[PDB]
Symmetry: C3
Subunit: 134 residues, 3 copies
């Protein structure tokens, strides 16, 4: 159609620790397949129910990446060194990409805060709305 909305969603990912960004499997939008080659994409990475396990102020970094690498990043962290319980910390990240540059895909990634294990066990999404410059 003339006003493309892209969406991918997951309900889980294998629990891993990583010092550097690794893909969140399944949060991937094939932009080239959509025939988006010019304009802008507003991309939302929505991880509403994550938690992190660890023993030194745990948390998770998340990123929106294209084939050109990370475009935006943010994290949550707990406020106790060893939380009584690793509570659910909703996380949203929003970035606008110029597709002209040579973007063929957008994806979600994550990485450990201070050696934390990274947990998704319910709904998470990666969404993009296509538009133009003003």
């Amino acid at each position: 159609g003339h006003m493309p909305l892209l969406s991918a969603s997951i309900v889980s990912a294998p629990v891993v620790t990583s010092e550097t960004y690794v893909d969140i499997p399944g949060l991937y939008l094939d932009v080239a397949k959509a025939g988006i080659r010019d304009g802008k994409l507003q991309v939302i990475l929505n991880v509403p129910t994550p938690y992190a396990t660890g023993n030194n102020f745990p948390g998770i970094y998340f990123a929106i990446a294209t084939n050109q690498g990370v475009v935006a990043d943010g994290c949550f962290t707990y406020s106790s060194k060893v939380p009584e319980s690793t509570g659910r910390m909703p996380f949203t990240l929003v970035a606008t990409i110029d597709v002209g540059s040579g973007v063929t895909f957008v994806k979600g990634q994550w990485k450990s805060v201070r050696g934390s294990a990274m947990h998704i066990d319910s709904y998470a999404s990666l969404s993009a709305i296509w538009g133009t410059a003003a």
Copy 2:
């Protein structure tokens, strides 16, 4: 218009406890009334300042529902069994619905984590952007 944006917003809701999803009153989009019958809707449920009261790791589940039921859901929870103070835990949930299936409305819902009372006493919104497949 040719590029509809739907929006509903509230500033409060009666405080309730519920084991199962109940509507957040006022967070409701009448899609049929808009004449949306085909394409996709990106729906954001934005509850930026909620809190939960309770005695067993309190929190709130939130959902986006259509007439076909829940499409996505997430929660926040505290990281203490009995928080010193029930702090404000911003919550965002994003989902993309294919409208063809027979969607006439989109709404926000909530339900208790472990018997928590659910509090909204400031701005919350439900938004939707209409588009098409790629």
Copy 3:
């Protein structure tokens, strides 16, 4: 173009305390410049990695404002009087503005919860998608 997306992003702001909303420098969209004069804007304020310092349940209020003042606001706050460590508390706020009113700009603002110092030291964005009424 015929389907504008507006975007502004920062990576930091001078740390300040403020009893009333002050601008988050750099989170500002010039809507008049875009030639948006009618329809709707869905505006997201995305502050994914903030923290607050203070000694009385710290937190930050955030707002979306136009030339007509604040349209929506929300806050995060910690659940301890003096957090062990001021953890990162992702914050998103979404609002839909009718541009006809006389809107020339949209901006993000913030203010202190109970005298908190307000910290941004990584990516934050302010985004807007243009549409029409249904």
